[PDB]
Coordinates of C-alpha atoms and ligand atoms in Angstrom, one line a residue:
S42 CA 2.4 11.1 186.3
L43 CA 1.6 10.4 182.6
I44 CA 2.5 7.5 180.3
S45 CA 5.8 7.8 178.3
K46 CA 6.0 8.9 174.7
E47 CA 7.0 5.3 173.9
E48 CA 4.0 4.0 175.7
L49 CA 1.6 6.3 173.8
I50 CA 3.3 5.1 170.6
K51 CA 2.2 1.5 171.3
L52 CA -1.3 2.3 172.4
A53 CA -2.2 4.7 169.6
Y54 CA -0.6 2.5 167.0
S55 CA -2.0 2.9 163.6
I56 CA -1.1 1.3 160.2
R57 CA -1.3 4.8 158.9
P58 CA 1.5 7.4 159.1
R59 CA 2.0 10.0 161.9
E60 CA -0.1 13.1 161.5
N61 CA 1.8 16.3 162.3
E62 CA -0.7 16.9 165.0
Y63 CA 0.0 13.6 166.6
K64 CA 3.7 14.2 166.4
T65 CA 3.1 17.5 168.3
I66 CA 1.1 15.6 171.0
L67 CA 3.9 13.0 171.3
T68 CA 6.3 16.0 171.8
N69 CA 4.2 17.9 174.3
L70 CA 3.7 14.7 176.3
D71 CA 7.4 13.8 176.4
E72 CA 8.3 17.4 177.2
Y73 CA 5.8 17.2 180.2
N74 CA 7.2 14.0 181.6
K75 CA 10.7 15.3 181.4
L76 CA 9.7 18.5 183.1
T77 CA 12.3 18.8 185.8
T78 CA 10.8 21.4 188.1
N79 CA 8.8 21.8 191.3
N80 CA 6.9 25.0 190.2
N81 CA 3.3 23.9 190.1
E82 CA 2.0 26.6 187.8
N83 CA 4.7 25.6 185.3
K84 CA 3.7 22.0 185.4
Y85 CA 0.0 22.9 185.0
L86 CA 0.5 25.1 181.9
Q87 CA 2.5 22.3 180.2
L88 CA -0.4 19.9 181.0
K89 CA -2.6 22.6 179.5
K90 CA -0.5 22.8 176.3
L91 CA -0.6 19.0 176.0
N92 CA -4.3 18.8 176.5
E93 CA -5.0 21.5 173.9
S94 CA -2.7 19.8 171.4
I95 CA -4.8 16.6 171.9
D96 CA -8.1 18.4 171.4
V97 CA -6.8 19.9 168.2
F98 CA -5.8 16.6 166.7
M99 CA -9.0 14.9 167.9
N100 CA -11.2 17.7 166.5
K101 CA -9.5 17.5 163.1
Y102 CA -9.1 13.8 162.5
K103 CA -12.5 12.8 164.0
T104 CA -12.2 9.4 162.3
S105 CA -8.7 8.6 163.7
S106 CA -8.3 5.3 165.5
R107 CA -5.8 7.1 167.8
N108 CA -8.8 8.8 169.5
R109 CA -9.6 5.9 171.8
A110 CA -6.1 6.0 173.3
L111 CA -5.9 9.8 173.3
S112 CA -9.3 10.1 175.1
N113 CA -7.8 7.8 177.7
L114 CA -4.9 10.2 178.0
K115 CA -7.2 13.2 178.4
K116 CA -8.7 11.3 181.3
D117 CA -5.3 10.7 182.8
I118 CA -4.5 14.4 182.5
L119 CA -7.6 15.4 184.5
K120 CA -6.2 13.2 187.3
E121 CA -2.7 14.7 186.9
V122 CA -4.1 18.2 187.5
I123 CA -5.3 16.9 190.9
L124 CA -1.9 15.3 191.6
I125 CA -0.1 18.6 190.9
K126 CA -2.4 20.7 193.2
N127 CA -2.1 18.1 195.9
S128 CA 1.7 18.4 196.1
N129 CA 4.0 21.2 197.4
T130 CA 1.2 21.7 199.9
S131 CA 1.9 23.9 202.9
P132 CA -0.1 26.0 205.4
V133 CA -1.9 29.1 204.3
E134 CA -0.9 32.5 205.5
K135 CA -2.4 32.7 209.0
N136 CA -4.8 35.6 208.3
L137 CA -8.6 35.7 209.1
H138 CA -10.2 38.1 206.6
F139 CA -13.6 39.6 207.4
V140 CA -15.4 42.3 205.4
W141 CA -17.8 44.9 206.8
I142 CA -18.5 47.7 204.5
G143 CA -21.1 50.5 204.5
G144 CA -22.0 51.3 208.1
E145 CA -21.4 50.6 211.7
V146 CA -20.1 47.0 212.2
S147 CA -22.6 45.2 214.5
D148 CA -21.8 43.9 218.0
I149 CA -23.3 40.6 216.9
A150 CA -20.8 40.3 214.1
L151 CA -18.1 41.2 216.6
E152 CA -19.3 38.3 218.7
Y153 CA -19.1 35.8 215.9
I154 CA -15.7 37.1 215.1
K155 CA -14.6 36.9 218.7
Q156 CA -15.2 33.1 218.6
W157 CA -12.8 32.8 215.7
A158 CA -10.4 35.0 217.6
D159 CA -10.4 32.9 220.7
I160 CA -9.9 29.5 219.1
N161 CA -7.2 30.8 216.8
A162 CA -5.0 33.3 218.6
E163 CA -2.1 32.5 216.3
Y164 CA -4.1 33.9 213.3
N165 CA -4.2 37.6 212.3
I166 CA -7.6 39.1 212.3
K167 CA -8.3 41.6 209.4
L168 CA -11.7 43.3 209.5
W169 CA -11.9 45.0 206.1
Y170 CA -13.8 48.2 205.6
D171 CA -14.1 51.3 203.4
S172 CA -13.1 54.4 205.2
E173 CA -15.2 56.7 202.9
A174 CA -18.4 54.7 202.9
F175 CA -19.9 54.5 206.3
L176 CA -23.0 56.2 205.1
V177 CA -23.9 53.9 202.2
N178 CA -26.3 51.7 204.2
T179 CA -28.1 54.8 205.4
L180 CA -28.5 56.1 201.9
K181 CA -29.9 52.7 200.8
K182 CA -32.3 52.7 203.7
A183 CA -33.5 56.2 203.0
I184 CA -34.0 55.5 199.3
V185 CA -35.8 52.2 199.9
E186 CA -38.0 53.5 202.7
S187 CA -39.0 56.6 200.7
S188 CA -39.8 54.4 197.6
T189 CA -41.8 52.1 199.8
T190 CA -44.2 54.8 201.0
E191 CA -44.3 56.3 197.5
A192 CA -45.4 53.0 196.0
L193 CA -47.8 52.5 198.9
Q194 CA -49.6 55.8 198.4
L195 CA -49.7 55.0 194.7
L196 CA -51.4 51.7 195.3
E197 CA -53.1 52.7 198.6
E198 CA -56.4 51.8 197.0
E199 CA -55.6 48.3 195.8
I200 CA -53.2 46.8 198.2
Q201 CA -55.6 44.9 200.5
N202 CA -57.8 43.1 197.9
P203 CA -57.0 39.4 198.4
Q204 CA -56.0 38.9 194.8
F205 CA -53.4 41.7 195.1
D206 CA -50.1 40.4 193.8
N207 CA -47.5 41.7 196.4
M208 CA -45.4 41.8 193.2
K209 CA -47.4 44.8 191.8
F210 CA -46.0 46.6 194.8
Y211 CA -42.4 45.5 194.1
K212 CA -42.4 46.4 190.4
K213 CA -43.8 49.8 191.3
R214 CA -41.5 50.5 194.2
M215 CA -38.5 49.6 192.0
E216 CA -39.4 52.3 189.5
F217 CA -39.1 54.8 192.4
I218 CA -36.0 53.3 193.8
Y219 CA -34.2 53.4 190.4
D220 CA -35.1 57.1 189.9
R221 CA -33.7 57.9 193.4
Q222 CA -30.5 56.1 192.6
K223 CA -30.0 58.0 189.3
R224 CA -30.7 61.1 191.3
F225 CA -27.9 60.3 193.7
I226 CA -25.4 58.9 191.2
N227 CA -25.9 62.1 189.1
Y228 CA -25.1 64.3 192.1
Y229 CA -22.2 62.1 192.9
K230 CA -20.8 62.6 189.4
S231 CA -21.2 66.3 189.7
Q232 CA -19.0 66.3 192.8
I233 CA -16.4 63.5 192.7
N234 CA -13.9 65.4 190.5
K235 CA -14.1 68.8 192.2
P236 CA -10.7 70.3 193.4
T237 CA -12.0 70.0 197.0
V238 CA -11.6 66.2 196.5
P239 CA -14.7 65.2 198.5
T240 CA -15.1 61.7 199.7
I241 CA -18.1 59.3 199.1
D242 CA -19.3 60.0 202.6
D243 CA -19.1 63.7 202.0
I244 CA -21.3 63.4 199.0
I245 CA -23.8 61.0 200.6
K246 CA -24.0 63.3 203.6
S247 CA -24.8 66.4 201.6
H248 CA -27.4 64.5 199.6
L249 CA -29.2 63.1 202.6
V250 CA -29.2 66.5 204.3
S251 CA -30.7 68.3 201.4
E252 CA -32.9 65.7 199.8
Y253 CA -34.0 63.4 202.7
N254 CA -34.2 66.1 205.4
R255 CA -31.5 64.5 207.6
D256 CA -29.4 66.1 210.3
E257 CA -25.7 66.6 209.4
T258 CA -24.2 66.5 212.9
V259 CA -26.0 63.2 213.6
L260 CA -24.8 61.8 210.3
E261 CA -21.3 62.9 211.2
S262 CA -21.5 61.4 214.7
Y263 CA -22.6 58.1 213.2
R264 CA -19.8 58.3 210.7
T265 CA -17.0 58.9 213.2
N266 CA -18.4 56.3 215.7
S267 CA -18.6 53.7 212.9
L268 CA -14.9 54.5 212.1
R269 CA -14.0 54.6 215.8
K270 CA -15.7 51.3 216.4
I271 CA -14.3 49.3 213.5
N272 CA -10.7 50.6 214.2
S273 CA -11.0 49.2 217.7
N274 CA -12.0 45.9 216.4
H275 CA -9.3 44.7 213.9
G276 CA -10.5 47.1 211.2
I277 CA -8.3 47.8 208.2
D278 CA -9.1 50.2 205.4
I279 CA -9.2 48.9 201.8
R280 CA -8.4 52.3 200.5
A281 CA -5.1 52.4 202.3
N282 CA -3.7 49.0 201.4
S283 CA -3.6 48.8 197.6
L284 CA -6.2 46.1 197.2
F285 CA -7.4 47.8 194.0
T286 CA -4.4 47.5 191.8
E287 CA -6.2 48.8 188.7
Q288 CA -9.0 51.1 187.8
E289 CA -11.1 48.3 186.3
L290 CA -11.5 46.6 189.7
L291 CA -12.1 49.9 191.5
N292 CA -14.8 50.5 188.9
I293 CA -16.6 47.2 189.4
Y294 CA -16.4 47.5 193.2
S295 CA -17.7 51.1 192.9
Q296 CA -20.7 50.2 190.8
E297 CA -21.8 47.8 193.5
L298 CA -21.0 50.1 196.4
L299 CA -22.5 53.3 194.9
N300 CA -24.9 52.6 192.0
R301 CA -26.5 49.4 193.2
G302 CA -25.9 49.7 196.9
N303 CA -25.1 46.0 197.0
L304 CA -22.8 45.7 200.0
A305 CA -22.5 41.9 199.5
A306 CA -21.4 42.3 195.9
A307 CA -18.8 44.9 196.9
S308 CA -17.7 42.5 199.6
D309 CA -17.4 39.7 196.9
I310 CA -14.8 41.9 195.1
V311 CA -12.9 42.9 198.2
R312 CA -12.5 39.4 199.6
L313 CA -10.9 38.2 196.3
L314 CA -8.5 41.1 196.3
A315 CA -7.6 40.6 199.9
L316 CA -6.9 36.9 199.4
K317 CA -4.9 37.7 196.3
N318 CA -2.7 40.1 198.2
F319 CA -2.4 38.6 201.6
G320 CA -3.5 34.9 201.4
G321 CA -5.4 33.2 204.3
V322 CA -9.0 32.6 205.1
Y323 CA -12.1 34.6 204.1
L324 CA -15.2 34.4 206.3
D325 CA -18.5 36.1 206.1
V326 CA -19.3 37.6 209.5
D327 CA -22.1 35.1 210.1
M328 CA -19.9 32.0 210.0
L329 CA -18.7 30.2 213.2
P330 CA -15.9 27.8 213.9
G331 CA -16.5 24.1 213.3
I332 CA -17.8 22.0 216.2
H333 CA -15.4 19.2 217.4
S334 CA -16.3 16.3 215.1
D335 CA -16.6 13.7 217.9
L336 CA -18.1 15.9 220.6
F337 CA -21.7 14.8 219.8
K338 CA -21.4 11.2 218.5
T339 CA -22.9 9.8 221.7
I340 CA -26.3 11.5 221.1
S341 CA -28.3 10.1 218.2
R342 CA -30.3 12.3 215.8
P343 CA -34.0 11.6 215.9
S344 CA -35.5 10.4 212.6
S345 CA -38.0 13.2 212.4
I346 CA -35.3 15.9 212.5
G347 CA -33.5 16.6 209.2
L348 CA -29.7 16.7 208.8
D349 CA -29.4 20.5 208.6
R350 CA -31.8 21.2 211.5
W351 CA -29.7 18.8 213.5
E352 CA -26.5 20.7 212.9
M353 CA -28.5 23.9 213.9
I354 CA -29.7 22.3 217.2
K355 CA -26.1 21.3 218.1
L356 CA -25.2 25.0 217.8
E357 CA -28.2 26.3 219.8
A358 CA -27.3 23.7 222.5
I359 CA -23.7 24.8 222.9
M360 CA -25.1 28.4 223.2
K361 CA -27.9 27.5 225.6
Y362 CA -25.3 26.4 228.3
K363 CA -22.1 28.3 227.4
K364 CA -23.9 31.5 226.3
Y365 CA -20.8 32.4 224.2
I366 CA -23.2 34.6 222.1
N367 CA -26.1 36.3 223.9
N368 CA -28.9 35.6 223.4
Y369 CA -28.5 32.9 220.8
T370 CA -31.8 31.4 219.6
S371 CA -33.0 28.2 221.2
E372 CA -36.2 27.9 219.2
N373 CA -35.1 24.5 217.7
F374 CA -33.4 23.0 220.8
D375 CA -36.3 23.8 223.1
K376 CA -38.6 21.7 220.8
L377 CA -36.4 18.7 221.8
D378 CA -38.0 16.2 224.2
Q379 CA -36.5 16.4 227.7
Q380 CA -34.4 13.3 227.8
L381 CA -32.6 14.8 224.8
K382 CA -32.0 18.2 226.2
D383 CA -30.4 16.6 229.2
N384 CA -28.0 14.6 227.1
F385 CA -26.8 17.9 225.5
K386 CA -26.7 19.6 228.9
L387 CA -24.5 16.9 230.4
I388 CA -22.0 16.8 227.5
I389 CA -21.7 20.6 227.0
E390 CA -21.5 21.5 230.7
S391 CA -18.8 18.9 231.3
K392 CA -16.5 20.5 228.8
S393 CA -14.4 23.1 230.5
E394 CA -12.8 25.3 227.8
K395 CA -14.2 26.8 224.6
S396 CA -10.9 25.2 223.4
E397 CA -12.6 21.8 223.4
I398 CA -16.1 22.8 222.1
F399 CA -14.9 24.2 218.7
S400 CA -12.1 23.0 216.5
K401 CA -9.0 25.1 216.0
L402 CA -8.1 25.8 212.3
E403 CA -4.4 24.9 213.0
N404 CA -2.5 24.5 209.7
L405 CA -4.6 24.6 206.6
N406 CA -2.4 22.9 204.0
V407 CA -3.1 24.0 200.5
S408 CA -1.2 24.4 197.2
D409 CA -0.3 27.7 195.4
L410 CA -2.7 26.6 192.6
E411 CA -6.0 26.3 194.5
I412 CA -8.7 28.1 196.4
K413 CA -10.9 26.1 198.7
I414 CA -14.6 26.9 199.1
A415 CA -17.6 25.9 201.2
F416 CA -20.6 24.0 199.9
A417 CA -24.4 24.5 200.3
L418 CA -27.4 22.7 198.8
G419 CA -25.4 21.2 195.9
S420 CA -23.4 24.4 195.0
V421 CA -20.3 26.1 196.1
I422 CA -20.9 29.2 198.3
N423 CA -18.2 31.8 198.9
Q424 CA -19.0 32.7 202.5
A425 CA -15.9 30.8 203.5
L426 CA -12.6 30.6 201.5
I427 CA -9.0 29.4 201.7
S428 CA -6.2 30.6 199.4
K429 CA -2.5 31.3 199.5
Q430 CA -1.6 34.8 198.4
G431 CA -1.5 35.0 194.6
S432 CA -2.9 31.6 193.9
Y433 CA -3.6 30.6 190.3
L434 CA -7.3 29.7 190.9
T435 CA -7.9 32.9 192.9
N436 CA -6.7 34.8 189.8
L437 CA -9.0 32.7 187.6
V438 CA -11.9 33.7 189.7
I439 CA -10.9 37.3 189.6
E440 CA -10.6 37.1 185.8
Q441 CA -14.1 35.4 185.6
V442 CA -15.4 38.3 187.6
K443 CA -13.8 41.0 185.3
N444 CA -15.0 39.1 182.2
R445 CA -18.6 38.9 183.4
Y446 CA -18.8 42.6 184.4
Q447 CA -17.3 43.6 181.1
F448 CA -20.1 41.8 179.3
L449 CA -22.7 43.1 181.7
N450 CA -21.6 46.7 181.4
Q451 CA -21.2 46.6 177.6
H452 CA -24.9 46.2 177.4
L453 CA -25.9 47.9 180.6
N454 CA -24.0 51.2 180.2
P455 CA -25.8 52.6 177.2
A456 CA -29.2 51.6 178.7
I457 CA -28.4 53.5 181.9
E458 CA -26.9 56.4 179.9
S459 CA -30.3 56.9 178.4
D460 CA -31.9 58.3 181.5
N461 CA -35.0 56.3 180.7
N462 CA -37.1 55.2 183.7
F463 CA -36.7 51.7 185.1
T464 CA -39.0 49.8 182.8
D465 CA -37.6 51.4 179.6
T466 CA -34.0 51.2 180.8
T467 CA -34.6 47.5 181.3
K468 CA -35.9 46.9 177.8
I469 CA -33.0 48.8 176.2
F470 CA -30.7 46.7 178.3
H471 CA -32.4 43.4 177.5
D472 CA -32.8 44.0 173.8
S473 CA -29.1 44.6 173.6
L474 CA -28.0 41.8 175.9
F475 CA -30.2 39.1 174.3
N476 CA -29.3 40.1 170.8
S477 CA -25.9 38.7 171.6
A478 CA -27.2 35.4 172.9
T479 CA -25.6 32.1 172.0
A480 CA -26.1 28.5 173.2
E481 CA -23.0 29.0 175.2
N482 CA -23.9 32.2 177.0
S483 CA -27.7 32.0 177.1
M484 CA -28.0 30.9 180.7
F485 CA -25.5 33.5 182.0
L486 CA -27.5 36.1 180.0
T487 CA -30.8 35.0 181.6
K488 CA -29.2 35.1 185.1
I489 CA -28.0 38.7 184.7
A490 CA -31.1 40.2 183.1
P491 CA -32.6 41.3 186.3
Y492 CA -29.3 42.8 187.6
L493 CA -30.8 46.3 188.3
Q494 CA -33.4 44.7 190.7
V495 CA -30.9 42.8 192.8
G496 CA -31.5 43.9 196.4
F497 CA -35.0 45.3 196.0
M498 CA -37.1 42.6 194.4
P499 CA -37.6 39.0 195.4
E500 CA -35.4 36.4 193.7
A501 CA -33.2 38.8 191.9
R502 CA -30.0 36.9 192.3
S503 CA -27.8 38.1 189.5
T504 CA -25.0 38.6 192.0
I505 CA -24.4 34.8 191.9
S506 CA -23.3 35.0 188.3
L507 CA -21.2 38.2 188.4
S508 CA -19.1 38.3 191.6
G509 CA -20.5 35.4 193.6
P510 CA -20.6 31.6 193.4
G511 CA -21.2 31.2 189.7
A512 CA -17.9 33.0 188.9
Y513 CA -16.0 30.6 191.3
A514 CA -17.8 27.6 189.8
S515 CA -16.8 28.3 186.2
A516 CA -13.2 29.1 187.4
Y517 CA -13.1 25.6 188.8
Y518 CA -14.3 24.3 185.5
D519 CA -11.5 26.2 183.8
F520 CA -9.0 24.9 186.2
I521 CA -10.1 21.3 186.3
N522 CA -10.5 21.1 182.6
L523 CA -7.6 23.2 181.5
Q524 CA -10.1 25.6 179.8
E525 CA -10.2 29.4 179.7
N526 CA -12.9 31.9 180.1
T527 CA -15.7 29.3 180.6
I528 CA -19.1 31.0 180.7
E529 CA -21.5 28.1 180.2
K530 CA -20.5 25.4 182.6
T531 CA -20.2 25.5 186.4
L532 CA -18.7 22.8 188.6
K533 CA -21.0 21.8 191.5
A534 CA -20.4 20.4 195.0
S535 CA -20.3 16.8 193.8
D536 CA -17.6 17.8 191.4
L537 CA -15.4 19.7 193.9
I538 CA -14.7 17.4 196.8
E539 CA -11.0 18.1 196.2
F540 CA -11.6 21.8 196.7
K541 CA -14.1 21.8 199.6
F542 CA -13.4 23.9 202.7
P543 CA -12.8 21.2 205.4
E544 CA -16.2 20.2 206.8
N545 CA -15.0 20.1 210.5
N546 CA -13.5 23.6 210.3
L547 CA -16.7 25.6 209.6
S548 CA -20.1 26.1 211.1
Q549 CA -22.4 27.4 208.4
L550 CA -26.0 27.0 209.6
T551 CA -25.5 29.8 212.2
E552 CA -28.5 31.8 213.4
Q553 CA -27.2 34.9 211.6
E554 CA -26.7 33.0 208.4
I555 CA -30.4 32.1 208.3
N556 CA -31.2 35.5 206.7
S557 CA -29.6 37.5 203.8
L558 CA -28.6 41.2 203.5
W559 CA -28.5 41.7 199.7
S560 CA -31.5 39.5 198.9
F561 CA -34.7 38.0 200.2
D562 CA -37.1 35.2 199.2
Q563 CA -40.6 35.4 197.8
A564 CA -42.1 34.3 201.2
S565 CA -40.4 37.1 203.1
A566 CA -41.4 39.3 200.2
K567 CA -45.1 38.3 201.0
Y568 CA -44.0 38.9 204.6
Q569 CA -42.1 42.2 204.4
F570 CA -45.0 43.4 202.2
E571 CA -47.5 42.8 205.0
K572 CA -45.1 44.3 207.6
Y573 CA -45.0 47.3 205.3
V574 CA -48.7 47.5 204.8
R575 CA -49.5 46.7 208.4
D576 CA -47.2 49.6 209.4
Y577 CA -48.5 52.0 206.7
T578 CA -51.8 51.8 208.7
Ligands
UPG747 O1 -24.3 45.8 204.9 C1 -23.5 44.9 204.5 C2 -24.1 43.7 204.1 C3 -23.3 42.6 203.7 N1 -21.9 42.8 203.7 C4 -21.0 41.7 203.3 O2 -21.7 40.6 202.7 C5 -21.3 39.4 203.3 C6 -22.4 38.4 203.3 O3 -23.7 39.0 203.5 P1 -24.9 38.0 204.0 O4 -25.8 38.9 204.9 O5 -24.3 36.9 204.9 O6 -25.7 37.6 202.7 P2 -25.7 36.1 202.1 O7 -27.1 35.8 201.5 O8 -25.3 35.0 203.1 O9 -24.6 36.2 200.9 C7 -24.3 35.1 200.0 O10 -24.2 35.7 198.7 C8 -23.4 36.9 198.6 C9 -23.3 37.4 197.2 O11 -22.6 36.5 196.3 C10 -22.0 36.5 199.1 O12 -21.2 37.7 199.2 C11 -22.0 35.8 200.4 O13 -20.7 35.3 200.7 C12 -23.0 34.6 200.3 O14 -23.0 33.9 201.5 C13 -21.1 39.9 204.8 O15 -20.4 38.9 205.5 C14 -20.3 41.2 204.6 O16 -18.9 41.1 204.4 C15 -21.4 44.0 204.2 O17 -20.2 44.1 204.3 N2 -22.2 45.0 204.6
MN748 MN1 -24.7 34.9 205.1

């Protein structure tokens, strides 16, 4: 709790008379202490009011002696926020949310999911999907593959000189990709409002048949067998469950699903809506349950193996002997000297039930204010989440997302509208975007400039700052500091220990997690490039 009005009166004592702004603080603080309620959101907002009233005074009477004491109070308030969110704690809705959008859900994913299912039978599995978009991944593959061979022919006579920037290939292919997306988006807009009310898949199908020389019956078979498959595996349609409660959110989701073909970004939107509406736990399909914390204590990590690769080896080991996921890599565990391998073999083979190899989630006690998130490399990462339905913070995150898109699209829309090619569209976008740059937004603006390239070029990672981690991180900042609409600052892993997804509940560092599906690094760029050229032989 906070100090009493009376107490504040002693500590901030000044020979001078009470400023009206001080009197207001005094009143907000007293009002807060006497706040007779158990509603967390209510208590938080009153904290917020109090904190704002303090900032006003302080930012007006910069010379006031009261400021020492009032700064102490702003410190106390930060702590109070944590006190509030760490009370009225109860277990999350027992749902496991997964998202697979845009094609057939893979058997591998189904295997990862199965491990969650086994350990946590008391939880409800929801495998979210879009019933109208099973053909999106095909479209993306057809577009990217065509553009690849276009760019290769174009550069056929330069690609193998040593000094050949693989990047010249990527800039050029992106011109072709962008054109092909405008081509598809345009056809789409010519169809979507017909009286025949066609679906996304209907439009994609037509397009592919006529413009990529694909067979319709095969497309249809793939479609129905993707829908068949997902329904048989916990599948639930986002279109049939009022996840999108307003056009704005459907629009954002759609620009990712259709215009960019960024399935991960579309997934970023869905998971927030699903937690908002149903509460529970979100998990990317490449996460696995946490390993029992004490299972492996007896075996000591060699000094030559780093922390992360040790966690990896543990996982490869459990899989070597239990084979819960065929045929899980063992590339790291086979490098172990013998004596070590046998220490793993002994321990793992002794355990009898999957029950006692991985930890059960059990009750995850959270407050209606918070959302918990996993960490990675010093930043939050949204591959794993916990939130009660309708939580304050989850709303903050959703709001951050809408605010970011709004800014993005205000500058992006006209640029696209121009039908310019990629390069010129980018300049129109950038000139606009950067003309509105301030110290406060400059970083954000820098991080979204290469938006159009996300998914097709190396190190285009705008997603982070629209719908991914960045949005969460600023939402935390908002929450923790009783701020609103924060764009400049992001809380990092060292800031968020109170909001961490419990370390013993999650195995990040899975074999599937080792590679991304909306992005790729410069070294796999130099790699995919070669694969491309090698093949083009
Ligand atoms: O064809 C696809 C590809 C991706 N996804 C979704 O995207 C998620 C994550 O994709 P992943 O291959 O694991 O990419 P990452 O590089 O690991 O993605 C990171 O960055 C993304 C963008 O912010 C976030 O959505 C992820 O949670 C975060 O782990 C998946 O679990 C799916 O739900 C699909 O639904 N269909
Ligand atoms: Mn992943």
